[PDB]
Amino acid sequence: HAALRQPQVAELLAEARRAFREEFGAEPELAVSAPGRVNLIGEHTDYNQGLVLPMALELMTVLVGSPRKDGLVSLLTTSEGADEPQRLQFPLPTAQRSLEPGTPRWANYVKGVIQYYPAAPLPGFSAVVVSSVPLGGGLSSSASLEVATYTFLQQLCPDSGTIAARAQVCQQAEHSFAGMPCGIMDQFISLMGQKGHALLIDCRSLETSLVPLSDPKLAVLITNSNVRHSLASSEYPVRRRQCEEVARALGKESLREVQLEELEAARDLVSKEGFRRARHVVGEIRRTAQAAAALRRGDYRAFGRLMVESHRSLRDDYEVSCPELDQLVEAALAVPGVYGSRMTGGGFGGCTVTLLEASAAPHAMRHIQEHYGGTATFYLSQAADGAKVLCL
Ligand SMILES: O=C1CCCC2=C1C1(CCCCC1)N=C(Nc1nc3ccccc3o1)N2
Numbered sequence: 437h438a439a440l441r442q443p444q445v446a447e448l449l450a451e452a453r454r455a456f457r458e459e460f461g462a463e464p465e466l467a468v469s470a471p472g473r474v475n476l477i478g479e480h481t482d483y484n485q486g487l488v489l490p491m492a493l494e495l496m497t498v499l500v501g502s503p504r505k506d507g508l509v510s511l512l513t514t515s516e517g518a519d520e521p522q523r524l525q526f527p528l529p530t531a532q533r534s535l536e537p538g539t540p541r542w543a544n545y546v547k548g549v550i551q552y553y554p555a556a557p558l559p560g561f562s563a564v565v566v567s568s569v570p571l572g573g574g575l576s577s578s579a580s581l582e583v584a585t586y587t588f589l590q591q592l593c594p595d596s597g598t599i600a601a602r603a604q605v606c607q608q609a610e611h612s613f614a615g616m617p618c619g620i621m622d623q624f625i626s627l628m629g630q631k632g633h634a635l636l637i638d639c640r641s642l643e644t645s646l647v648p649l650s651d652p653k654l655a656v657l658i659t660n661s662n663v664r665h666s667l668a669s670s671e672y673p674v675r676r677r678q679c680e681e682v683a684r685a686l687g688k689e690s691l692r693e694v695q696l697e698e699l700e701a702a703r704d705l706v707s708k709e710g711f712r713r714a715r716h717v718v719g720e721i722r723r724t725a726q727a728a729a730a731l732r733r734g735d736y737r738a739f740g741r742l743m744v745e746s747h748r749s750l751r752d753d754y755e756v757s758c759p760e761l762d763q764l765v766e767a768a769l770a771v772p773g774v775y776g777s778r779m780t781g782g783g784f785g786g787c788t789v790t791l792l793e794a795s796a797a798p799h800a801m802r803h804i805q806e807h808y809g810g811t812a813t814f815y816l817s818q819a820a821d822g823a824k825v826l827c828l
């Protein structure tokens with residue numbers, strides 16, 4: 437129970453290209469990659485036009501492939517947790533006949549991005565898909581597969597848009613083809629990550645700022661609870677609706693426009709539950725601004741305190757934690773050298789994120805595992821690059 441090895445892109449490339457040479461009988465022409473993500477702080481704020489502070493991970497999805505001349509798409513994935521079958525072929529969608537979600541589920545992410553890809557003419561293509569992002573494990577495996585697909589389609593047929601327009605295609609694939617009405621964060625960080633930086637994203641204006649996060653004395657420890665309660669899927673849209681009810685009641689376009697003071701004075705305009713949801717949201721936006729300021733001046737102790745307040749708010753007000761994540765966090769915070777820890781992503785399972793002195797990392801891992809009633813998985817990750825292309 438040491439940290440799980442993260443394969444370099446080169447091992448992933450070598451594996452994908454071999455599988456491709458075997459599967460299709462020729463060398464692939466193209467390779468792309470897009471990372472998974474951990475959100476340092478700013479949870480359940482993106483769809484509230486809030487602030488988020490994710491970083492791209494050294495875990496990533498790689499596509500290798502070649503355009504076809506017959507208008508068909510032919511896919512193979514090797515990812516272990518992928519659902520059967522591992523292969524799927526389908527014709528390109530047309531104005532007459534669209535793609536539709538189905539089986540196997542892993543291909544719905546690719547189909548969705550193809551369906552909403554904005555530029556024409558898109559040729560068909562053959563592609564192999566491999567990934568080190570744990571599938572469905574809370575680090576945005578699906579966003580990385582969407583953005584990798586998008587980054588591949590740009591090579592088949594360049595688009596002429598902005599990065600946020602690409603994120604929104606990928607978000608639409610997730611909404612329509614995976615049935616998960618996500619905000620913009622995961623797609624945007626997968627696109628926009630830079631090595632050694634976190635990305636402050638303003639989800640109202642779509643301004644982004646690269647915040648340096650690279651200090652050998654510091655580490656980021658990701659802990660996978662390896663649990664995912666069914667609520668991760670069904671209660672996420674419930675939270676979106678509750679935030680929208682509160683913004684409507686207060687006559688605000690979004691909770692970005694609402695402050696705690698304003699909220700407390702309109703306490704009689706919303707449900708008790710709604711008040712709790714919106715108090716989290718307004719507070720988390722302020723905490724994300726404060727955390728970004730702290731990171732910049734190298735104030736990790738303060739950054740870690742804000743992380744802990746974010747977890748408590750998520751646990752108690754937004755109510756999207758779970759006993760597994762809580763036990764993970766309470767264990768991390770008992771380790772000397774740990775600045776702060778909190779659940780990351782949507783909640784009801786998945787991962788926690790911990791900011792700690794680098795030297796403290798193996799102690800945190802032994803202790804967190806021992807106080808965890810389940811089986812934990814660990815990643816030590818630096819801030820990674822976002823989507824990349826390599827001609828083969
Ligand atoms: O079960 C659901 C529910 C929760 C979110 C989660 C999914 C599935 C569906 C099919 C396989 C298991 C998980 N996978 C995506 N992500 C993803 N599947 C990939 C396949 C190849 C490469 C990259 C990939 O990313 N996320």
Ligand SMILES: Cc1c(C(=O)NCC2CCC2)cnn1C
Nearest residue numbers: 445449467468469821824825826
């Ligand atoms: C900038 C970059 C790359 C790259 O040159 N191309 C991406 C494809 C090669 C296989 C995936 C890989 N990893 N990173 C971070």
Ligand SMILES: OC[C@H]1O[C@@H](O)[C@H](O)[C@@H](O)[C@H]1O
Nearest residue numbers: 479480618619620621781782
């Ligand atoms: O911050 C909570 C997050 O839950 C996700 O993982 C969803 O995909 C994101 O858009 C964001 O809303």
